[PDB]
């Protein structure tokens, strides 16, 4: 039930909130301090995963390890490309509790 | 036992012999054929559970439990069939209350408490709120492993 819940909430982050897709943009948003949640596919390289975790710890923002992969994370985002890392600027749908 | 039931048997394998006496230890128990075949009846559901559980002293036991749904004294319906969820809950309950009578005690006080089948009696008591059961017993236990055969344990089981 958790996976369908996070998929539905991710779908509702699209079309209603400000997000950003990809690694470079995620790091840019994190170091600007406006990334409130970072989602990582388990297909992510371990070095990239650890570095994004350290960046989030510095920015004091949450990291969710998606139980899919970059293909499945891309499908969950509603896109037709692989996304391996993404950030939510503001959910608009209570995925990120106020 | 002096005055206990007669449908229960024990295996009692022999480990050490000294003098003209063969000294035994528990190997397993089983019900008799006639009692088991008399208990199984139509128009009722029987629940069978087994669990591999290790004693404190290293004896591994496979306890088999059986239980039969009991019709009420005022029941008009021919059959007393429990639903699949009820049978599953009964099986889970009587697995987890065969585990705890073995995990926390030695083989000796396991054997002496399955002598009156107290485990089956409290299983019968525990399942009344799901579906009544009447013929509840530990049908079988078999010895799966034995711990190295310390002679002192055998002698204190026989002697004091």
């Amino acid at each position: 039930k958790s996976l369908e819940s996070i998929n539905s909430r991710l779908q509702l982050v699209m079309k209603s909130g400000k997000y950003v897709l990809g690694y470079k943009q995620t790091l840019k948003m994190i170091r600007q301090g406006k990334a409130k949640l970072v989602i990582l596919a388990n297909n992510c390289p371990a070095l990239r995963k650890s570095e994004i975790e350290y960046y989030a710890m510095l920015a004091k923002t949450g990291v969710h390890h998606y139980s899919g992969n970059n293909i499945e994370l891309g499908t969950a985002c509603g896109k037709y490309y692989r996304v391996c890392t993404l950030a939510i600027i503001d959910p608009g749908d209570s995925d990120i509790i106020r | 036992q002096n005055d206990e039931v007669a449908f229960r048997k024990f295996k009692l394998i022999t480990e050490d012999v000294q003098g003209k006496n063969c000294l035994t230890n528990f190997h397993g128990m089983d019900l008799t054929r006639d009692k088991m075949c008399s208990m199984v009846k139509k128009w009722q559901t029987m629940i069978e559970a087994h669990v591999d559980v290790k004693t404190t002293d290293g004896y591994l036991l496979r306890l088999f439990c059986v239980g039969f749904t009991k019709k009420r004294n005022n029941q008009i319906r021919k059959t007393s069939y429990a639903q699949h969820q009820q049978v599953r809950q009964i099986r889970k309950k009587m697995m987890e209350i065969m585990t705890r009578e073995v995990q926390t005690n030695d083989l000796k006080e396991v054997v002496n408490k399955l002598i009156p089948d107290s485990i089956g009696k409290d299983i019968e008591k525990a399942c009344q709120s799901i579906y009544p059961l009447h013929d509840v017993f530990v049908r079988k236990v078999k010895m799966l492993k034995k711990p190295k055969f310390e002679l002192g344990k055998l002698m204190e089981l026989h002697g004091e």
Partner: protein, 102 residues
């Protein structure tokens, strides 16, 4: 002509019923079609109950029963006279013959 409404078996809302082997001739018979007799016989004959009681080391010893469930194909059932052919109206009833207790 259709001899029986249930076609001589209890299969009503099923497609297939698992087969069993006749206890007499080991014929593969469907489980719902074979004739079943649950015989509950004293393990010793009525002629020998007194002698076993005399030779028993116990005083209040109950003689054990012998529980056997028998399955017959209708061929062996008819040949062994457990079931008999009946009239057209007498085929319809399903009441088992009475135990004849007295």
């Amino acid at each position: 002509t259709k001899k029986r409404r249930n076609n001589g078996r209890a299969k009503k809302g099923r497609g297939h019923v698992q087969p069993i082997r006749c206890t007499n001739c080991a014929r593969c018979v469907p489980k719902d079609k074979a004739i079943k007799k649950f015989v509950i016989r004293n393990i010793v004959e009525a002629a020998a109950v007194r002698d076993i009681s005399e030779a028993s080391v116990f005083d209040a010893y109950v003689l054990p029963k012998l529980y056997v469930k028998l399955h017959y194909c209708v061929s062996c059932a008819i040949h062994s006279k457990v079931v008999r052919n009946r009239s057209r109206e007498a085929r319809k009833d399903r009441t088992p013959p009475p135990r004849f207790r007295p």
